[model samples]
Structure formats: structure tokens, C-alpha cells
Target chain A: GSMIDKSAFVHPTAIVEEGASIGANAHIGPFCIVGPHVEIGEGTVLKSHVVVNGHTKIGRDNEIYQFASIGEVNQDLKYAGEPTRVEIGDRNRIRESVTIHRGTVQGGGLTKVGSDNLLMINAHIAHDCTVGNRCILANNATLAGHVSVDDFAIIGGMTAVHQFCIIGAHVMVGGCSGVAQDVPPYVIAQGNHATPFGVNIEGLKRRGFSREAITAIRNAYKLIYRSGKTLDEVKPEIAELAETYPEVKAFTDFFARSTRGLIR
Target chain B: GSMIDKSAFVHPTAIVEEGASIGANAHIGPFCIVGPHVEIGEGTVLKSHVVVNGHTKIGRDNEIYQFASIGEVNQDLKYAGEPTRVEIGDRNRIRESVTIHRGTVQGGGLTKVGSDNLLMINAHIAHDCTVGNRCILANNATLAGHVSVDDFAIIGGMTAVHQFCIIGAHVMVGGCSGVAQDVPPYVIAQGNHATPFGVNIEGLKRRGFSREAITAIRNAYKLIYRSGKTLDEVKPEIAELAETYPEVKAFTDFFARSTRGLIR
Candidate 1:
């Protein structure tokens, strides 16, 4: 049964709609708005002036700061009155003035965010964007509609990911970059129309990746970007390299699934 | 005496500090906060969750949308507890999560915005910025400290202007541009570190500039940007040309006063 716990501290100035549900120890601060069909899990806190609307389901221990507009209707011109949804996982820090919209019907009817993500001030997640676990979207970073960000990706401040772009796992996009194409796994990308600089070797090393794996990624990056071969010509070589290093599978899988061409 | 009109609507949840003044037919929506020394003129609307603080004065018929933070403290590290100010003129439409900060003491102690401006969602105007009439700052367009934007300039979405940069009248900056230097009047610019594209001839035509004026401006553009001659070499020529074509005075004056050289 959907119910609010006695221990939950909902500020008197906050507005909770008829069908909204708040779990145990959840705190809704002053001026926050919880709309109909919104379900917040235990230990979640909506700080002052936050707004969670539409069909939103937020899991445990998420701290959403002031002026954040989560689960709002999509800005996509094609979006009609379809009852789309927004699903957020646990332990996420959604900071000030961040706007996360619900999915559009055309974009599978759901926007999803995984656990431990840090979305900083004024960051925007447009309709149908998928943010994976431990992602960091820095201040004013924007993910356009239908974009996909994989685990441990870092989108730097003021950067914009183009619509339908895929940012693969462990990628690092530099500040103020404009990314229009797919970024393959473990790459470091920067510039206006982002060009890949190299493998994220330092990041991988810091994340406890073995030296052998880091070296393998470096070789793969050279094959993709520096080898002067067309991606088609290098695919076979990358495949062969993957045979030697199982960790290279992430890169191969990204290449196989990428609809937009990689930023090489 | 600080007073609100009988026709004005202030939502019950909103907070208006003493000495804040609201004019006739003004509407302050839910959860908004109007701090002391703030004055709103006739028919202005703060549409939910807005925060207007500091020594700010906003003129009539402005519509400020939800989560817009106006007249906030400047982000400048040098800023102390100085009583800096923000002045916004009439009929501006400031959209969601837009942040307009007050001025810094070193940067003239005041931030200014003229009439008929449209600051789109998440746009930020930092300390001491001066935005002239009829400007459009698109989504996430950021003006750093001490920036000056002349009348009718259109800053495209996600563009970031460097501190102390001057964006001249009728200039159009392309999306995702990082403008690190002054952009002369009636120019078009694009790219990461924005490179000048040519005269904004189409914009001049739309604005009803004479054909002779346009041609003269184009020649000035060639002198300033394309000619192999140093800017010092062209300044005398530009000064002479400004006598023949009064429209060229903007270019000559800009060059005369430019501290950071033009983005040639």
C-alpha cells in the first residue's frame, strides 16, 4: 500500500498532491512540490523549493537540492499528453537548479538515472536521456534528448552532448566541449565538435585498472584514431586485440552498438 | 512607504521582506521570495519559486519564470559585503533557472539589463554585466564578469563569453561558441574559440540598414579582419571611412576603446 510514514518530515509549506507517496524518514522541505503519482523511497530528501512532478519514482537516499525541477514534462515539441515517466535510483546528489524531464513516448516513454550520480548546479537532463551509475554531470552540462551516458562517465561543466549521442563507460569529456558524435569507452574527448585526444589512461589507472588493461586500451585508441586506417579497416584489428584482452570488450561492444560514428 | 497594490496577487506561501515594494497588478506566485530594497514595477510577474534579492529594481511588464534567481550575490572571489545593485528594465522574459547576479565593487558596483530582453532557460549573467535593449540570450548562454552586450545582440545557446568581453550591437554568436575576445558590431561568429564568420549582412538587411551602409560596413569588416595590415594600420583608414559612413563609427569607436583586441 502506498503511504507516508509518521516519521517523515514534510514541511507545512510544502505541497503533496493526493496520489503522492513518501516513504519512512523522507523529508520534504519548505516550498517543495510533490505531484500526483510521485513515489519517493525511504531516506530521500527533497530540499527547499524542489519540484517533483509527473509520474516520478525515486529510490532511497537521494538528496535533491533547492530549485531542482525533477520529473517535469519534456520540452520535446513532439511530446503530447502521453503519461511518460522518470525513474531515479539511490544515493544520487541532484544539485541546485537541475532540470530532469520525463521521457517522451517516442523515446521509449521513460527517462532513467542510476545510483550515485552527481548532477551539479544547472545541469539539464532532457527527455529520454539515460544516465548510468556514478556519472558526474558538472555545472551547466546538458544532455540533449535521447542521449545515453554509460557508467563512470564525467561530463564537464558547460559541455553539451548532442541529441542521440552515446557517451560510453569511463569516458571523460572536457569542460565546454560540444559532443555531436558517439564517444567510445575509456576515451578522453575535448574541443567544440569534440575530437578524442587519447585513451583515458590516467583515469583508468586511478580507478585500479591493471597496467596491462591500460596499455591494451592505449593500443586500441591508436588503432581507432592514430593508425590512419578507416574504422572499417581497424575493426578487424580491434577484434583481434580484444581476443588477447577481455577488458577490450567494452570498446568493441560500444563500436558495434553505436549508431552515430565515433569522435576520432 | 513600501506598498503592494490591491490588484496585485501574492501567494500565501511567498515571502516578501519589509521595505520590498510591489506595484499595481503585480503577481508574485508560490514560494517566491522578495527581499528588502527590491522594487517591482507595474504588471510584473514572478511566476513561482523565484528569488529576487539585493538592492534590485525591476521595471514594468517583466515575466520571470520559476526558479529564476535574480540579484543574487556575485560569484567573484574578490566580492566582499559591498552594497552592489542590479537594475532590470521593462518587458524582459527571464526563463527557468536563469541566474542574474549583482555587481562587484571593483567592476563598477552595478549590473544592468535593458528593455525587451529574453534570457532563456539556465542563462547566467555574472557580476557587472551590462546587457542592452532587445537582446536575446539563449539557453545556457553565459556572460562572465564585466561583460558588455550591446543592443539587439543574439547570443546563441550554450555560448560562453569571457570576462570583460564586449559583444557589440546586432552581433550574432553561434551556438557552443567560447568567445574569449571582443566581437565587433554586426559580426557573425562561430566555433569553440569563436572565429569571425563575416559581416551579419542578412541581419543588417532585416534591421533595415541602407545598402550603402551595409557595403561600407563590409569594407570596414575586410579592413579589420581580412586585410594583412595591422589594426594600427587600419585604424586611420577606419577613422577616415567613419566620416563618410556614420555607421562605421561603431566599428571605429569599438577599436579605439577595445582593451582586449578584437576576435580577428
Candidate 2:
């Protein structure tokens, strides 16, 4: 038997199959289909023609727009249906025709998205992607399989990040870009095989970064991008900068986790 | 009354609203919705969870995959529910979560796609777009409003064409590129602000272009790209070459209709 809360509004046209869980105040709008294993949290709104299937858990207050396909099978040919799952946190605006695929067993068996993100029209999160809080993946922006996006990053309209890439926190990628490598935090990137134009100056300021901290980050960026030194050479200097400014840890810590090298 | 043919199979859970017309051999799969004014042709397959809304006319043998939203209104803010339409020709494979929006009255009141196309995962055909026969819009490839793609074109995965741009016949756009200009036929374009790199040699050969015709086209390409001549100066030379080799006309004929300037 499905467990639907008393306050939930499941539309007449919607089909909430047996064994599903719909939390309080969840509005499953017209023509929606919630499969048996799905769990939708409180105050969430599925605004028409949404299909939440597979082993998925959607958290509170998220507004998923029309024509969305969540927790679907991954596009990978190697996928053999091992019951991988998708977990989404609260307050996300997952917009028109957006797609979020379930993870593959080989890629850790889970795809995760933390809260407060805006995934715009036709944006895709492929298998095993991890998207952090406050990110905006704009119209037609796509993250390929195993991609990871950190907090507060803005992937511009029509941008495509390659598989296994990491987009660091607070980075802003330009519109119509191709991100083939890792993007370290607090940078502004643009172009087909993207390169760092500079640090995201105005964005850092808007986010309440102090002048001293931003100055240290800027110097760290220059050391990596402008100093003509290899990443191996400048990494020690960046680690040194991390001591004086707490925010610089995002830049230094990224190097340790990054498998694909940072964008030039 | 809905005119569903005896040969057709409409799923019991699917909705064929009044005034819809279903052709012979059509298969309306589970949880699909066909709007009142919609007409689906013979042998067309509307897979599960599809919504065919508005005044849409789809031709025979089209296979629209799961989570598709066909004939949706344009995303333009200025649209106010004008009586526009979408027309699809035969034998198309509109794959997973593809979106095709209706045209705006201001944009000739029609969005049209010719036959034998393959629109892959999450591809979008926006308002007033006209796509010709045998085209392949790969995964996440998007055509903005008023974009026109000629016959035999292949828009690579993760590519986005700007509004009002024309992609000429037999052209191949590389993956992760942005097309902001008119790309004439037989060109291989790649990059963010995409430019013609060279002739699409192997493609023309595969498409059965003769050696003499291809050689003449290559000479014409040299005149336009290698000689550094303006379009005005090169037009006559290109036109003259078009007489002997008819395939070369696709390169020259694009200029008359191209509103966007040719990519450098």
C-alpha cells in the first residue's frame, strides 16, 4: 500500500502507484506518474506531466516543472539494471523537460543533488552526477555521466561539461561553452574548450567576500593561470595562501580531489 | 468524436480527447495524451508519458519516445496563446524527452519538420523552426526560434544554434559548438563561435558526391576562405562554379536566404 499524507493533493489524472510515499502538502499535478519505489517529500509540487520513477527520493519544497523525467535509467549502454538510485535535496526549481538519470552500480550506485538549485529548460544530469547546493544549470546546459558540480556554480545556457569533470564552488561558466576539464572555485570560464578568463571578481564581492580574502584568491589565481607555471609548481604557493585566508581552502582542496586537471 | 481506426491500438489509460484523429496502425501507448486538435498519422508510435497538445499534425511512421512534450507553446514571454501549429513529416525518431514547440503568429504561425529525422535525447525544436529531411539532431542539440536546418544536416551532440541562423544542407557541426551564423553546406564547423574549418570531404563521399563535383566545390571553398575575398566579390565565382557541378549550388544558394552573416 502507498503512504500518501492527508494534506497531499494527488490530482485525479495522476497515477500514484502502490508502495510510493507522498509527504504532506505534496501536489502531484495533472498527468503525473509516481512509480512504486519513489518517495516525494513535503510541500513539493510536480506541475503536470511529471514522471518520478525508479528508486528516487525528492526532498521538500522542490518545484518540478512540466515534462520532467526524474530518476530514469541512465543512457549508458553498460547499465544492466542493478537498482541504482537518485537522491535530490530540498528547494530546487527543476524546470521544463529536465532529465535526471539514476546512477550506475559501477559509478558508486548513487546520483545526488543537494538543495536550492535551478536546473533550467532541457538541462540534463547524467548517471552518477553530484550537484551541490545553489547551483544554476541554465537552458540546455548538460552535465555528462559522473560529472560533479560544487556549490554556487553557474553553468551558462547551452554549456556542456564532459564526463568525469568537476565544477568547483562559485565558478561561473559562460554561455555556449564546452567544459572539458575541471574548473577550480571562484573563476570565470568561457569558450569551446574553456579556459579561465580570470577570477569571478564581482560575483565574489556580491557574495560578501571581504577585500582581503578576495585579494588573496586573485593572487592565487594569477599564480596558477598567469604566472606560466605548471600546476605542480604553483600548488605549494596556493597551499601557503590557504593559511592566511580561510576561503582559499576551496581553491587548494580542489586540487587534491581533481582527477582531470584544472582548466588553464 | 475521436476517429481512432480499428487497426490502431490506444492504451486504455491513455486519453484521446474529443476532436482528435488517430490514423490506421497508430499505437498510442500507456499514459499518453492526445489533445482535441491533434492528428496522429498511420503507424506513428506515441510512447508512454507523452503529451501531444495543441494543434499538431504528425505524419506517418513517427516514433516519439518517452517523456516527449510535442506541440507545446513557445517559451517566448510575448506569446499570448495565438492559434499557431506544429507539423511533422513521416518516419522520424523523436527520442527521449524531446520537445517541439508550436510556432508564434509573429513567426509565420508554424513550426515544421520534414521526414526521416532523428532527434535524440533532450533535443529541442523551438518556435518557428523549420527542419528539413534526413537530419539528425543529436543529444541535447537545440535549434532556437526561427532557426532553419536544411536537408541532410547533422547537428552534433551538445550544440546550440542561435536564433534565425540557417544550417545549409549536408553540413556537419561538431559537438559542443555554438552556431551564431549561417553555415553554408559541406562545411565542417567547430568551436564556441564556430567557423568553417574545411570541407566535409568524407561526408560528401558517403553521400555519393562525385569526385569532379567535390573538386570544383573545394576550389570554390578556396575562393571564399583562402583568397580572403569578400562575399560580394566571391559570389560570381561561386555562382559560375555552380553551373558545372550542381552540388556546389548548396554552398552558393545559402547566401540569398541567410539573415545571419556567414561564420568566419
Candidate 3:
């Protein structure tokens, strides 16, 4: 019952299981294993040794390099043969040895990745993780189960975020650090039991955030970190700034969603 | 001209290039690529989708899981296709997608691994490294070029050891840490730019080190880390204790060879 396209090229040694679907112009390279119930979109390229299995759907033009293990059963032992799934959007680069595990039923039954992200060597996204667009997870960066990485976030090499944590938009986490809590938008965090390190002003400029918008965000950072007031006391000020700068609104929205306490 | 023993089994889809040597009872599974200069010893097993290239020599009874990339060219940009090599000893369990790159000419032209090691999923040994017997590199642990891991050391998950650093025997490095310097024998180290965290007494006891010997090693640790004295000031006391206990001698020898300084 596989639905492979006429124009698709499957290497002679690759194994495409009976119930798998390969879209037009997709390239499945040597030694790859595409299991039953998997759907690969048009123009996607799987390099040698890639494994796309289970109830997974991959979007078009993504580049999955050698040894990337996508949609494997999650490491969480609580998983009990549930029909969970993985969904990856367009144009992501899944680099060498990276692992993206499928979600558990308890975690909404779906592990999802958005478009234009880059997962570097050995980067791991555990079950129920949601990655937004244009994020970069460097070599050996790991997101434990239920973690969410928002748009344009960059996690440095060898960093590990704790379970259920949220990395907000435009955040930059430094290398070899262990994050035990949530990282709000537009900040820089580092170290074991990671805490905030001012604003990611340099990264914001590179992403083309205007000086006025960045200044407003910087003021928001001050209210959160530098101010002697409690987070509850500062909520009104943050909301006020959000009225003018949409970037600051991201911070306001993030605070509302963050259940794991702020990186402290 | 490939030399294949009659008892060796190469899967029909596997590509065993000319000049490769497969010994008695060796099993090269489906879609594996064994390069010309590779020599695999007796009783070795490679599961599907492995790529073993370069001038590599692997010894007896080793188990390499799916998609592990052994003896690939080092990631160092300075590599110019030099004739470097990788040498592996017996009974090592190189797990899924683990990578072991070959050496650089500048790095003495070799990367060597000893017996009974368990390299978990996506563990990486970069070029010019040396791993001694019974070491356990947990999932996503990384050893950069020129690193040396002594016998029985256990590097935790998601840890990254800096280049040229030495991890001494029986040391226990915690997960999600960065080791920027030498970790002396039998000590526990953790954190980013990791520092010492007392002796690995529990691990020593498990490894069958006598209580009296462990006491001497504990005293030696006090001299190095807790004595509030300079390392040079404490070396003589460590040496004096080493004369009575061989385990203490390991600490003495480690201090003499620790060019990157102690984990601090």
C-alpha cells in the first residue's frame, strides 16, 4: 500500500516498507529504513543511514543527513505501545546522529517540529517536544521530554534543557550548560542550573530587530531581572510596553505560559 | 584484493571494498560499507548501516550497532586526507550512531580504544583520542581531539571534554557538564568548566578498592583539593602516602602528568 512517486529515487539498498509513502522527487539514500505508516513529502532528501519510521510525516525539501534517527520510540519508559506520532515541517536540516523521538500519549500524542530549523550533530529532541521555525540546536544540545523551543532560539553545543521547559523566542543558551527551568524570550542564559545573563542584544540585531524594539525589550529584561520588584509587581509594566512593541508582547505572552519557574 | 575468511559472513547488500580483511566468524550486516584499508578481526559484529572506512583495525568480539560511523575522517578542517588511523581493542559495545573519527598526522597519526568499553548512543570520540579499558561514555558524551580517558572512568551523558584534557581512572563525571581541564584519578567532577567534587568513594568501593587503600586516596584528595595549600606544596605529602598505598600512587602520577591543571 505504499504510495511512492514516479520521479522519486530510492537507493537499491534502502528499505521502504509496504505502508510507507514517498512523495515526488524525494531521495532515499543507501541503507535508509522507511517503515510502515510514514509519509515523506516531495523533494525531501534522506542521506545514507537515515531512519524514518513509525507514524511520522515529514514535509518537503528537508535535508536529513547521515545517521539521523527520526520518529523512533521515545526513551520515556512510561510509553506503552501507544499510537503516538511525529510531525516535521518543511526545510529543516537534521544533521548527523540527531534523534527526534515520537511523542507519548500522555504528551498529546504528537512530537512536532516547525520549518527551517537546524539540528546539529547528536542533538536530541525527546518525546512531545515542539520546535518553532528558524531555531538552531547546536551539537549535542538536548531537549528533554515536553520541551518547547520557540522561533529563532539558538541552543549551544552540549546544553541540556530539563523536561517541560520552554525556551522562548530569540533566546541564546550557552554551550555545555544544564538548564533546570524555563528561559523567557529575548534573553541569554548559561551555566549548570542556568540563570539569565542580561539580554541577547547582539543576536536581536542580527535577526534585524530595530533599535527601538530592542531598546523596549531591554527595558522589559530590566523589569524582569534587575528590578527589585517581584514578577507580579512588574507584570503591569511589561503589559504596558507590549502595547507599543510587538516584540515585548512576546515576553508578556511567554510569562503567562511558563509553568517552570524562570531561569534563576 | 579483499581477504575474506570462509567462516565470515558478509550480508549480500554489504559492500566490502578491495583490500579489506574479514576474519573468522566476522558478521558484516546489511548495507554496511567496509573500506579497502580496514581490517576487522575474528568474532566482530557490525549491525546494519555501519560505515567503517580509513586505515582502521578493529579487534575481536566487538559489537557495533546500526548507523555507527567508525574511522571516518576527523572533523578538523585542517585534515588534508592524511594517512592517519584508528585502532580498537576487544569487546567494545559501540552503540547506535556513535562516531569514532581517525587521527590527524599532527596528533601522532592515531586514535586508539581499549577493551570492554560501552559507548552509548551518539557518543563521540574525535580524532587523536585514547580510551583505556572498561570506560563507559554515556549517551551523547563527547571527547574532543587529543583527549585521553584512563581505565574505568565513566563520563556521564551529554558531557563534553575539552581537547587535550585527561580524564583519570575511576573518575565519575556528572551529566550535562563541560570538562575544561584534567580530572585527577578517583575524583568526581561536574559543572560547566568542571571543578572537583571530592573523591569517587562509592565508585571505588564498587570497583573493589580496599577500604584502607580508599582511605589513603581520600587523604590524598584532601591534600590536593581541601588542604588550602598550593598543589606544589601538597605533592610531597601525596608522594609519601603513595609509598604505602598503590591507589594513592595513581593520584601522585596523575598530578605529575596533569598539564591542563586539575579540575578547578
Candidate 4:
């Protein structure tokens, strides 16, 4: 299973290092450079001119388009080369020129990307970022170090999420917005210093979230945003709401763990 | 000609299509993909992994770094396979991951970039965007479709210019600015939803503009920004001042044709 399968087609111009492992039916197209410690799973395709280096593991059926630099060294200034890793799950589409960097030892030594993500052209996921399943990162969407994006989040084009920011599930960030703080679940945020606009009801509805769950989330948003009450004051009320609707628990848990405070 | 020049050195791994014309002393490095209708001029150097496609014409002595995609199809939603073109003039430095798209028929069917420009890494020029001579677009400076940037404009890193916007000559846009409107000549603009700051004094000094000319432009900026008068009321005053100082003519001309209004 560790050997390069006979069914796989590696282009003559591609450079697969001696210790690299290629699974069955993987297609390594022209001019790709796969590093020594890299492991590519079955049916994955590198379109062309890609560079996958460092201690990286890519799972099955991923399609990486031209010029993507995946599993490269971290951009962190404090990085001192501690054999950090990048792990990518199945069925992701990484478009042209996108860059996904590996982790730094200080950042728990691993960067992870889950399945079924669409990272558009020139989008950047910096060191130690963890992106969950079914995420859509539009063109030039940039995530700095240690960022965490939950499932079903859609980050718009040219948006910048700052270091250590947590984007909760079903959140939709508008284009060209700068997000320096955490974005709660089901919220829609926009602007230079992002402020919550409202709940992402349209996104929730498309994802088959129940009407009652959405209503509860909307009520939770009002309590957090419009009520003018501090987070501490509304904590008990949010917990009670979460108890009634299990879908709302993501918001409660996010609020409980938030350290940089939520976007106002 | 179907034949590549004997003087040109194309790497064994590079793919130059049959209809493509490579000029004298050109260097096509490894993993490059040159399409059929592309024409590269004399002394042009394309570093590894570059892709030049569509009906593109590149001029002499241009150094295009790795992963730069020139003359690709535009991202515009209305685009419908027009034979639009990209024309780049001489002595330009196109850095890594820069994507320059072709024109749309509605946008006069052409995207033009003049000589001696430095387009930094990951900069994107969308369809029909016209960039004039001696400009510096820093890393990640994104210009949307049909945007026109005049000579000597310095667009800072991480800036995103709105579509159809005009950035006038010698203007300096600060880093991370989101420009949604026109930036007039010789002015400095910064911040999201960019607002005019002041005259680009340091830039003018560096370009060998006289003190009197700088002062005249400064006064012109004051008339436009600090006068507390509507554009209609200040038009005559600015026009009269422009008659005295020819350097101020750039500002007056910009105001004369500004359709989307100016960044105030």
C-alpha cells in the first residue's frame, strides 16, 4: 500500500522524491514536485505545476489545480523547523495558485483541512489553520496563523481573517472585509473591522436546518447583539436557549471558549 | 512562424504550443505552458511554471517570475468567449503568482499594460484593466474588471480596487485600502472605503517635481477636499487654478470626466 501503484500515471517532468508514497490511481501531472516525506492517497490529481513539500499527508480523490503550493513551510517569523506537518482530507478542490502552509511547533505542530472544501484561486491558508468540511473560501480569501473555520462557512473573496480567529459554523463573511475577532455560528459579517449584520438564515435554510432551530439562533443573535447586554450578563439565557435547541449549542460553546471577544 | 528562434533557450520540460512565437534571446524555463496564440518578444524571460495563454502579446525584456498566468480568461460572470486580448509593453517585472486576464467585448476588447511596471507577487489584474507606465502594484493588489490605473501610481500591498474605478497618475494608495471610487491624480488615499488624505508629497519629491508644482497640487487638493464646497461650486475655482499651473491640469482633467465621483 505504501508503494507507487502501477495504475498511477506520474508525468515525466514531475519530481517525486525517493521516500514519497503514491497510492493507487493517483495522477501527478506535469512539473509537480512531491517531497520525500509526502504521502498522496488514491485517485488524487495534481493538475500541473504544483509543489507539495514538507511532512504532508493528502487523502483520497482531491483535485489540486495548477501552481498550488501545498504543505510548504510556515510563514511564521518564529519558525525554526521542527518537522511540523500538514494534513488534508478527501475530496477537496484547491484552485490555481492557492497556498496552504504547514504548522509551526509553537502552534501545536499541525495544520489540518477536512473534506469537501473549495478553496478558490489565490486563496491562502497560513500556518496551523484548521478548516472543517464543506467550506467555500472564495478568491483571495486569506487566513492567518492558527485560525479555525468550522463546517459550512463561506468566506467571501478578498476577506482576511486574522490570527487565532475562530469562524463558527454556517457563517458567511462578505467580500473585502477584515475580520480581527471571532465570528459566531450562523452569523453574517461584513466591513473593515467586521461587525455582525444578522443571522445567515438563507445559508442555514439551504443546509436543511429546521425552521425552529433557525428561529432559536435568530433569538440568540438578538440577545448577543441587539440586547445591549454584556456577554457575561447573557450567558445564562444563551445556555437555556441552547438546552431547548441542540443546534444552538454551537453558538453557546463558541461563546464559552472565545477569548478575543466576538465581533460586536 | 511555427519555428522557435535558435537564439532562444526553452527548457526541455517546458511546453510551447505550435502557433506560439518566441523571439530572439528569449528564455523559457522549466514547466512553462505557452499557448498557441501567444507571442513573446525579444529578451523576454519566463521563469519556471509560468503560463501564457490566449491572444496575448508580450514586449521585450520583461522578466516574468514563476507561476504568473498572463492573458487568462477573465472571472467576469458575463464573459462569453470573445477573442479579446492582453497587450503588455517592455521592461516589466511580473512577480510570482500574478494573474492578468484578457478583455471582454463590452470593455473595448483589450487589456493594456504599458512599460516599466513592477507587479508584485499575487497581484491580479482582471479583465480589461488598463495599467500605464512606471507603476508599482505591491503584493496582493487586486484590480477588478475595467479598472484604469494611470502612470506612476503606487498601489500598496493588500489593496482591492473596485471595478470601473480610475486611479489617476502619481497617486499613492496606502496598504490594505479598499478603494470603491476614483482617486484623483497626485493625491494620497488610505483606509477602507478610501478617503483622500493629502498630496503625495514624498512621491512628488522623488519623481523630481518642483516645489512650486507640489505646492500647486497641494492647493488643488485643498480645493477639492478641504474647501467644504460641492464639486459643482469648486469646478470653476479648480479650473482657473489649473490654467496657472500645468501640473494641476492632471487634477482638473480627472475631475472633468469622473463618472462615479471621486474619493473625498
- Top of the candidates by DockQ: 1
Q: Candidate 2 lDDT, tens digit per residue, B48-157?
A: 78899999999999989788899998997788999799999999988777899999988898999999998978789999999999999977888999999999999988
Residue-level lDDT of model 3, residues B1-264, one tens digit each, is 269999999999898988999999999998898989999999999998898999999999999998798988776647888989999999999999898989999989999999999999989998999999999999989998899999999999988898899999999999978898999999999988788999999999998999899999899888888889999888888888888897888877787778898887
Q: Give the docking tier of candidate 4.
A: acceptable
lDDT of 3: 0.91
TM-score of chain B of 1: 0.97
lDDT of each residue in B135-188, candidate 4, tens digit only: 999998999889999999999998889889999999999998889899999989
Evaluated on the second chain alone, the candidates' TM-scores are: 0.97, 0.98, 0.98, 0.97
Tens-digit lDDT string for candidate 3 (A1-264): 278999999998899998899999999988899999899999999977798887999999998977889999999989987889999999988877889999998899999999999887789999999999999997788999999999999997888899999999999998887899999899999888888998999999988999999999999999988998899999999999889888899987898889998987
The ten-residue window of minimal lDDT in model 3 chain A covers A1-10
Residue-wise C-alpha lDDT for candidate 1, range A97-185, written one tens digit per residue: 89998999888999999999999998999899999999999998989889999999999998889889999999999998889999999
Which of the two candidates, 3 or 4, achieves a greater TM-score against the reference? 4
Ranking by DockQ: 1, 2, 3, 4
- Candidate 1 has an interface RMSD (Å) of 1.4
**DockQ for candidate 1:** 0.42
Instruction: Give lDDT: candidate 4, residue B53.
Output: 87
Q: Please give the DockQ score of every candidate, comma-separated.
A: 0.42, 0.42, 0.39, 0.36
Model 2 / residue A78 / CA error / Å: 9.3
**Candidate 3: pairs in clash:** none
Model 4, C-alpha of B218: deviation from truth (Å):
4.9
Every model's TM-score: 0.76, 0.72, 0.71, 0.78
lDDT of 4 by residue, A65-139 (tens): 788999998889999877999999999988788899999998999999999998977989999999999998977
Across residues A53-163, which tens digit of lDDT does each residue of candidate 2 receive? Answer: 999999999999998889987766578778999999999999988989999989998899999999999888999999999999999888888999999999999888988
lDDT for A123 in candidate 3 is 90
